[PDB]
Structure 1
């Protein structure tokens, strides 16, 4: 596509506003937003995580007003993690930090990630341990070899289904994704404190170095997210991932292309 002028006028702009719920595993009817308690395999060879123990990428495909050549161009993003103050519940079946103390709050490894694109997020598969057996009902790197622990170019995929692509074995493919803007931070360590900021005054500009945002193929906007905030420790010491929803507001304009 050769990119030409922006359309102007009342009709030329539109907005998407929505939220993506986290997909942490949801091990039972009371534990939406949590994973199953984490168990550790006896050996590398025997690593076989159950689906409800594996956080997955969230994705939404948002239909835009039909245009047809014009395409919707995503220009700005406001985004926020929803429910940050829930982590102040340190009185609910947790593990006391010391005798008579409050419960240990959610903490430890986090991944906060979001993207806005004009097509599905492109994924590259990378595994901690290539002998991990990923479970039925997930989509994972197939024919994994030892080289998959560092880089195996066979593992290419699209983030095209919710509750399906486990976080731990996929990343945005930096060799593609030219029509998407993605941003993420993995903060490791078992004791790391969550640090969650909220404001309605911050905008991210989605334009590239040529002044062009993601262009929405087939008039669909793709939003993706992961917000694994840390782990919740219950009184037994067992730990579960806890996630939160992410708010998106995207402003778009119509752009002519050839």
Structure 2
């Protein structure tokens, strides 16, 4: 692709607006947005998480107005986590901080991640423990070895399916993803406080150092997200991941290529 000039005129821009729901595990029909309570294996080698205990990456492929050579170029993004105030419910069967106290709020390990691309997000597999048995119905690094704990280049995949790719197994592949922009923060530790900002006044520019944004192959925009906000502690002490949805607004323009 030689990238040429931007088209102008009223017809030359379009806008995508949507939300991606979190996929935390959904252990029963009342617990959308939550994982199954977390249990711990008896040995390192016997690590064997249930499917409904593993948060996954979310993805949406959004069709754009048909063009044909012109391509849609993603230029700007507004994004935010939806429902941050729900985490103020400290009265719904949680564990009291101390005698007569309110319930403990959602807190601890979080991963907040989003990406915008002109093709599927490309993933690299990395395992905390290569002998972890990942459950049926997930897509996980295959033929794991001890090198998979640091870097095994065999573990390549595309984020091309929902409720499938566990967060703990996969990261954006920094050796690829030239046609995607991705942003993520892992904040680890059992007592980490959620710090969630909302505003409709902040815009991220998606242009690279040459002034070119993601170019949407086949007229599809790919949006991906994870928002594991922390863990909810129930009265018994058992803990569940809690996630929230993410809003995306992307502005695109037509770009000629050869």
TM-score, normalized by the shorter chain, greater than 0.5:
yes
Which TM class, normalised by the smaller chain length? over 0.9
Shift of residue 206, structure 1, vs aligned partner = 0.1
Shift of residue 201, structure 1, vs aligned partner = 0.2
* Distance (Å, rounded) in 2 between the aligned partners of 1:44 and 1:214: 42
* Distance (Å, rounded) in 1 between the aligned partners of 2:195 and 2:205: 23
Query: What corresponds to 2:196 in structure 1?
Result: 196
> Deviation per CA, 1:146-196, whole angstroms, max 9, x where unpaired?
000000000000000011000000000000000000000000000000000
1:237 to 2:207 alignment: no
* Distance (Å, rounded) in 1 between the aligned partners of 2:98 and 2:91: 14
**What TM-score results when the alignment is normalised by the length of structure 1?**
1.00
> Deviation per CA, 1:198-247, whole angstroms, max 9, x where unpaired?
00000000000000000000000000000000000000000000000000
CA RMSD of aligned residues (A): 0.3
> Deviation per CA, 1:92-111, whole angstroms, max 9, x where unpaired?
00000000000000000000
| SS of 2:182 mapped into structure 1 | strand
* Distance (Å, rounded) in 2 between the aligned partners of 1:88 and 1:45: 38
> Deviation per CA, 1:8-38, whole angstroms, max 9, x where unpaired?
0011000000000000000000000000000
| SS of 1:76 mapped into structure 2 | strand
* Distance (Å, rounded) in 2 between the aligned partners of 1:53 and 1:200: 33
| SS of 1:86 mapped into structure 2 | helix
Shift of residue 44, structure 1, vs aligned partner = 1.2
* Distance (Å, rounded) in 2 between the aligned partners of 1:239 and 1:195: 20
| SS of 1:218 mapped into structure 2 | helix
| SS of 1:136 mapped into structure 2 | coil
* Distance (Å, rounded) in 2 between the aligned partners of 1:203 and 1:124: 28
| SS of 1:143 mapped into structure 2 | coil
**What TM-score results when the alignment is normalised by the length of structure 2?**
1.00
* Distance (Å, rounded) in 2 between the aligned partners of 1:235 and 1:218: 50
* Distance (Å, rounded) in 2 between the aligned partners of 1:43 and 1:75: 49
* Distance (Å, rounded) in 2 between the aligned partners of 1:71 and 1:2: 12
* Distance (Å, rounded) in 2 between the aligned partners of 1:62 and 1:43: 43
* Distance (Å, rounded) in 2 between the aligned partners of 1:133 and 1:111: 22
* Distance (Å, rounded) in 1 between the aligned partners of 2:86 and 2:250: 26
Corresponding residue pairs, total: 258
* Contiguous gaps of at least 5 residues in structure 1: none
> Deviation per CA, 1:17-67, whole angstroms, max 9, x where unpaired?
000000000000000000000000011111110000000000000000110
